[PDB]
User: Fold Phosphopentomutase from Bacillus cereus.
Amino acid sequence: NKYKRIFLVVMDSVGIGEAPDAEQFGDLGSDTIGHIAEHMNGLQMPNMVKLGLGNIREMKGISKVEKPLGYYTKMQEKSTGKDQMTGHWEIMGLYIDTPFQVFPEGFPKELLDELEEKTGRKIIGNKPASGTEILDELGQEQMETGSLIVYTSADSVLQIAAHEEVVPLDELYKICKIARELTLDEKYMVGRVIARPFVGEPGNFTRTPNRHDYALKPFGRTVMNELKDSDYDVIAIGKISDIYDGEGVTESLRTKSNMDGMDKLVDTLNMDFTGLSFLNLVDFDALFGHRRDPQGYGEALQEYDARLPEVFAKLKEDDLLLITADHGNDPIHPGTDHTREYVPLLAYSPSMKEGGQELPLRQTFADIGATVAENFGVKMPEYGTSFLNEL
Ligand SMILES: [Mn+2]
Ligand SMILES: [Mn+2]
Ligand SMILES: [Mn+2]
Assistant:
């Protein structure tokens, strides 16, 4: 093998400007990193700059360098959608025709009618809200009537809240499984159904750790599956295991924050393993992109950048570091959805003694999967073109 270990980092939602097909999505003008850089009066990301981020595209505070540490380019998304699962599934070698939906005005009556029809229970709420907001508003009615609080977020989720004393936990799980089946329908396709049991009294409701998630498996066997099947290590960090519903995963490390994500990445650098360590840094998307908070987003990017030199110091000659994103989520864009954008790609190993060069633009995110597959000698994905030989 050319590399013994590949460290793949998804900066979640960290897009590098509108894609050629942005108009279809209402995403003309979208530029996640660029708009953040303008807001910050210049982003301070010296380590990403050293890797060649400015060589992909110059932005405020982000300039090109003469000798980038590694190779650089951007990637274009080929799949129909701009959601979490589409982006990640494409990265690991798939092509996804059918996009996962978001519901800023709640779910269609048809879906909620069938859920009522199958459960014999009333549904209340039906809007995007935080757990705290929806329980403050509807928690008491839920307790008193035995109704189900159905809500969503800015992402592709259907969430069902019920008080543990009123709706038995096991009944809530059964209901969520029904909802999971009903939402395997391209009109109502949600990435994730989430059980949100809660306890307490009016004015003091808390969501319990009895939360359960109901995800869909990727629409195909991924490069992760192939790695696992060939007895390679596949270490998933953060939301990665959940995004792939555990498919191809050999170890999963939960994280609480971006900084904690970088700590677990460091933990994997300290592990003897052969295969893939795969990190998702989700805060960019979950805290700042959807909340349209360019200041928080900018600060988060600077906090992440400052962590990189330790990663650089720990990389071995036979290690490869890959840094990319899965879509955009421009914090100055209208609405609360993701934006259809190119994503950066940086590929660095200390064995690149002469530094890196520009790679041809990646025509699908699956080029990452193809590169991983070729490196480890496992079955090549149906989609994607490896850039391994270019490194
Ligand atoms: Mn838009
Ligand atoms: Mn994402
Ligand atoms: Mn998101």
About this structure: DSSP finds 13 helices and 13 strands in the chain. The first strand starts at residue 5 and ends at 11. The radius of gyration is 21 Å. Residues 25-27, 333, 335, 337, 339 surround manganese (II) ion (ligand 1) (CB under 6 Å).
